[PDB]
Design a protein around this ligand. Sequence first.
Ligand SMILES: Nc1ncnc2c1ncn2[C@@H]1O[C@H](COP(=O)(O)OP(=O)(O)NP(=O)(O)O)[C@@H](O)[C@H]1O
Ligand SMILES: O=C(Nc1nccs1)[C@@H](c1ccccc1)N1C(=O)c2ccccc2C1=O
Ligand SMILES: [Mg+2]
Length: 283
Amino acid sequence: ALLRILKETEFKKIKVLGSGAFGTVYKGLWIPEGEKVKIPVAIKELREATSPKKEILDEAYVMASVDNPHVCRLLGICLTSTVQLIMQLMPFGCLLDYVREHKDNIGSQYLLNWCVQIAKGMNYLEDRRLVHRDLAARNVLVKTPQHVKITDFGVPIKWMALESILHRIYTHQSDVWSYGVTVWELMTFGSKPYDGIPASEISSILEKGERLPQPPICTIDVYMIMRKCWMIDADSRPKFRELIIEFSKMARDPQRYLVIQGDERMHLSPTDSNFYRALMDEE
Ligand SMILES: Nc1ncnc2c1ncn2[C@@H]1O[C@H](COP(=O)(O)OP(=O)(O)NP(=O)(O)O)[C@@H](O)[C@H]1O
Ligand SMILES: O=C(Nc1nccs1)[C@@H](c1ccccc1)N1C(=O)c2ccccc2C1=O
Ligand SMILES: [Mg+2]
């Protein structure tokens, strides 16, 4: 009952934001009936063509029902030939591009905190018994640089856990794998995982014990957590709840666990967030 159902005439596509696996995502404008305002929105038109599924809507009723600062919520759904999902527009985009776009202007406090946040979001999804199945930096959106949120829960071979490849098994402990790649992405500043290895050969390099490398900025504490996320015996992997504590502990002394050049001139200020939070993130 938390899922507004929109008519086709009260919103319009305005700019393409990118496509991916399941759909295309536009910047749309919501025009409330009777009103002369245009409220911006993010729409994701599916890539299929719904035919009285049911299935979807029954899932959108869950997605729309996730109250947590760090996980994004489906806001509405227009059931059209191509179904349209509507959610809050995030101008900064996703954390992938953001770390890319700011390659040499990201302190250790940010990175360690993003890691904290994605964990908290993930942990909430775990507690809600939902498996993300597609956690990656491109699916972490930036509300403000200080607040990131997971989107798109509910084939990224290069992020999947070995067992999800070999046996299509998506348990929570495999999302902890994807979490491991995501942090890797964060610390490598947008690098591409296994860049060079065809995505038909990952199941083999993984079974040989091959794993992504230690990013430059990473220490032994920050890279050993990652490695655990990528262990074969699924249950030998950290629980999301234990990554919050570890990463939260490291975030309290970041220049000690991340070694970044000029880290001395790049940090979080109360005036600059009290300004950010009124204009954008009013939690
Ligand atoms: N709610 C949103 N607000 C703003 N930008 C968004 C929003 N949702 C998605 N985007 C952006 O639109 C791009 C395309 O969306 P999408 O195809 O769903 O993401 P993707 O990660 O690249 N594909 P996928 O591998 O399936 O998760 C994303 O990478 C984001 O940068
Ligand atoms: O629409 C989605 N993301 C968007 N990006 C730009 C505008 S909406 C995501 C999603 C958004 C927020 C939280 C969780 C998931 N989503 C659904 O809820 C959903 C339901 C049923 C079928 C397919 C999907 C799907 O892909
Ligand atoms: Mg996505």
